[PDB]
Amino acid sequence: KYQIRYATVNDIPNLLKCATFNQPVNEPFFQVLLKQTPTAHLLLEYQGELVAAIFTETKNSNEVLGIREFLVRTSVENWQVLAKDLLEFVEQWGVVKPGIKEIEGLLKYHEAISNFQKSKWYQSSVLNKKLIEKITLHELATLELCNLMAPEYELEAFAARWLLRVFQDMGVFLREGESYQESELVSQLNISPRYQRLLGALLQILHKRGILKIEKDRVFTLARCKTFALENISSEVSAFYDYFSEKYPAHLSWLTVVKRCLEKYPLILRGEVDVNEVVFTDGDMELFAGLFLGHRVADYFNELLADGVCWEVEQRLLEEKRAQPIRILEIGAGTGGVTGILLEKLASHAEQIEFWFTDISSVFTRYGESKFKQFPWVKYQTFDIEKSLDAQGIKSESFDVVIANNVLHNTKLIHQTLNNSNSLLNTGGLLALLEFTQPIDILLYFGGLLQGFWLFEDPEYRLEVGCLLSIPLWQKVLSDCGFDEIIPLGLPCEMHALSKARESVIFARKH
């Protein structure tokens, strides 16, 4: 029923579609291995379809045989028994090859296929390969987190000292050894209903900085809370503002928003003042837009998101059926900050592409058309990712690229949101996300003030006590919702440590 034969260079297109165990695929590298050792690499075919393939190498002065790569085609039905059959063939065929003594390390491959864990295995695509190269060679590849995230770190350290003083101004945490239950602080602080969960997240900020001990049933103030808070808000905030504005000017927006929030936090938390009157002063959306451009980490993720979608569009422009334009949709495009850098990128291909600038709020789609009315190929629509496509007049499975920049977490059930995102794309379409992926303090002070931050009803798939997902949780939920080829991206210095990354661009593909 199936055939084992030598790989050839003619098999390279199909080998590039495989999941790989040791490293991402690489067209020019498969070429060189097949040119240098044309009878060292076996594949297994079943009805013309490629199922599994094994590349070997000879090592240790030519006496032991090693596996250099194990490729599998996971969408073939019984592939695990077939890949086991190819493994056992290679062992037999390898020990009797001229000169070999031993086959090195087959048990790891046997275990990998029988207990299959899709996230261990690399997958590849032109897109994956081009983004890794870009990250590897980026100007920021030489710097480390302490340099790159310094502004965020120092803002968050100061803001936490302010936040403890805000609690002390509302009557709690002046002394070490106070004992509360969380429900009792909600009452004693008179937190309005909408912000009771935000209070949990704010307590959690102080917990991670050693100010409070939060346990199953009780919040307990520790010794460090006697000395940690700011002592004079007005003069110390003024002094920090001067220091921070001059030293990290590109982060001025973050400092301004956090300043405007904390200054009025007791009244905001008690429900006595609205946040749109305090921080969204007089429809000053420009302040809020600058949170996400202008500084080198934010521009790095924007460049990563935008180049990825640009590359994917050119990949699909290389296809001869033509006909329908390539349709891109951006969910929650907002003030169109990252959108603007992408439209400039795609603008060369304006006649084959169709770009939908969308947001749940009519306010932001009209903001968008005010900024992009010169682009004939950008269309505007209100769209809510949590609401039915039909009711919103959108054909399912009609988009090639869906873009969502830090919006998808502001929903009730992340599995329903990604299903709906899946419904947007046709098979092979590309999901492109930019997400904060740690429960970062900086985001709570203002982002936690908005209602979308607290819709979530599936905490089992979120971090700590907020609405964010980590890289692993995103990988889990994206696979659960019918995406594969998931590519999580962080700063270059943490590509090996993304489970702790604050921010991440994630691409994924509908299968």
DSSP 4: E
The structure tokens listed for 190 are 């008179």
Contact 506, 435 (CB under 8 A): yes
The structure tokens listed for 486 are 């998931």
Looking at residues 347 to 366 of the shown chain, list those that interact with ligand SAH (rule: CB under 6 A).
359-361, 364
- Output the CA–CA distances (angstroms, integers) from residue 462 to 147, 199, 433, 436, 449, in the order listed: 28, 17, 16, 12, 18
Closest CA to 381 of 394, 370, 371, 397: 394
Q: Which is nearer to ligand SAH, 22 or 361 (CB)?
A: 361
CA 382 to CA 394: how far, in whole Å?
A: 11
Contact 435, 406 (CB under 8 A): yes
- Output the CA–CA distances (angstroms, integers) from residue 116 to 78, 108, 390, 484, in the order listed: 13, 12, 38, 15
The structure tokens listed for 7 are 């790989």
Q: Which is nearer to ligand SAH, 73 or 371 (CB)?
A: 371
Contact 328, 342 (CB under 8 A): no
The structure tokens listed for 374 are 């010169």
End-to-end Cα separation, the chain, in angstroms: 27
Which of its own copies, ligand SAH, none interacts with 292 (beta carbon under 5 to 8 A by kind)? Answer: ligand SAH
Q: Is 250 exposed, middle or buried (0-12, 13-18, 19+ CB in 10 A)?
A: middle
The structure tokens listed for 164 are 């403890």
CB of 193 to ligand SAH, least distance (A): 21
CA 485 to CA 483: how far, in whole Å?
A: 7
Contact 397, 420 (CB under 8 A): no
Q: Is 100 exposed, middle or buried (0-12, 13-18, 19+ CB in 10 A)?
A: middle
CB of 216 to its own copies, least distance (A): 8
Which of its own copies, ligand SAH, none interacts with 23 (beta carbon under 5 to 8 A by kind)? Answer: its own copies
Q: Which of 151, 290, 334, 368 binds ligand SAH (CB under 6 A)?
A: 334
Which of its own copies, ligand SAH, none interacts with 325 (beta carbon under 5 to 8 A by kind)? Answer: none
Q: Which is nearer to its own copies, 66 or 325 (CB)?
A: 66
Please state the separation of Cα 244 from the chain's center in Å.
28
CB of 289 to ligand SAH, least distance (A): 6
Looking at residues 62 to 121 of the shown chain, list those that interact with ligand SAH (rule: CB under 6 A).
none
CA 310 to CA 332: how far, in whole Å?
A: 19
DSSP 223: G
Q: Which is nearer to ligand SAH, 166 or 331 (CB)?
A: 331
Which of its own copies, ligand SAH, none interacts with 227 (beta carbon under 5 to 8 A by kind)? Answer: its own copies
Q: Which is nearer to ligand SAH, 331 or 353 (CB)?
A: 331
**Per CB under 6 A, which region of 235-243, 268-276, 335-343, 466-474 contacts ligand SAH?**
335-343
333 counts as binding ligand SAH under rule CB under 6 A: yes
Q: Which is nearer to ligand SAH, 18 or 425 (CB)?
A: 425
Vertex 82, ends 81 and 83: CA angle to 5°? 95
CB of 213 to its own copies, least distance (A): 9
Looking at residues 377 to 416 of the shown chain, list those that interact with ligand SAH (rule: CB under 6 A).
383-386, 405-407, 410-411
125 counts as binding ligand SAH under rule CB under 6 A: no
Which of its own copies, ligand SAH, none interacts with 452 (beta carbon under 5 to 8 A by kind)? Answer: ligand SAH
Which of its own copies, ligand SAH, none interacts with 361 (beta carbon under 5 to 8 A by kind)? Answer: ligand SAH
Residue holding tokens 């990128």?
Answer: 345
- DSSP element (H, E) containing 486: strand 483-489
Q: Which is nearer to its own copies, 8 or 23 (CB)?
A: 23
Q: Which is nearer to its own copies, 69 or 503 (CB)?
A: 69
* Axis crossing angle, helix 252-263 with helix 150-169, rounded to the nearest 10: 10
Q: State the residues that interact with its own copies by CB under 8 A.
A: 22-24, 59-60, 66, 68-69, 104-105, 108, 132, 136-137, 141, 144, 146, 150, 153-154, 157, 176-177, 179, 181, 184, 209-210, 215, 217-218, 220, 222-224, 226-227, 495-497
**Per CB under 6 A, which region of 153-161, 179-187, 200-208, 334-342 contacts ligand SAH?**
334-342
Binding site residue list for S-adenosyl-L-homocysteine: 335, 359, 384-386
Which of ligand SAH, its own copies, none interacts with 75 (beta carbon under 5 to 8 A by kind)? Answer: none
Give the largest CA-CA distance in the chain: 84
Q: Which is nearer to its own copies, 236 or 458 (CB)?
A: 236
Which of its own copies, ligand SAH, none interacts with 150 (beta carbon under 5 to 8 A by kind)? Answer: its own copies
**Binding residues for ligand SAH (CB under 6 A):** 292, 331-335, 337-338, 359-361, 364, 383-386, 405-407, 410-411, 452
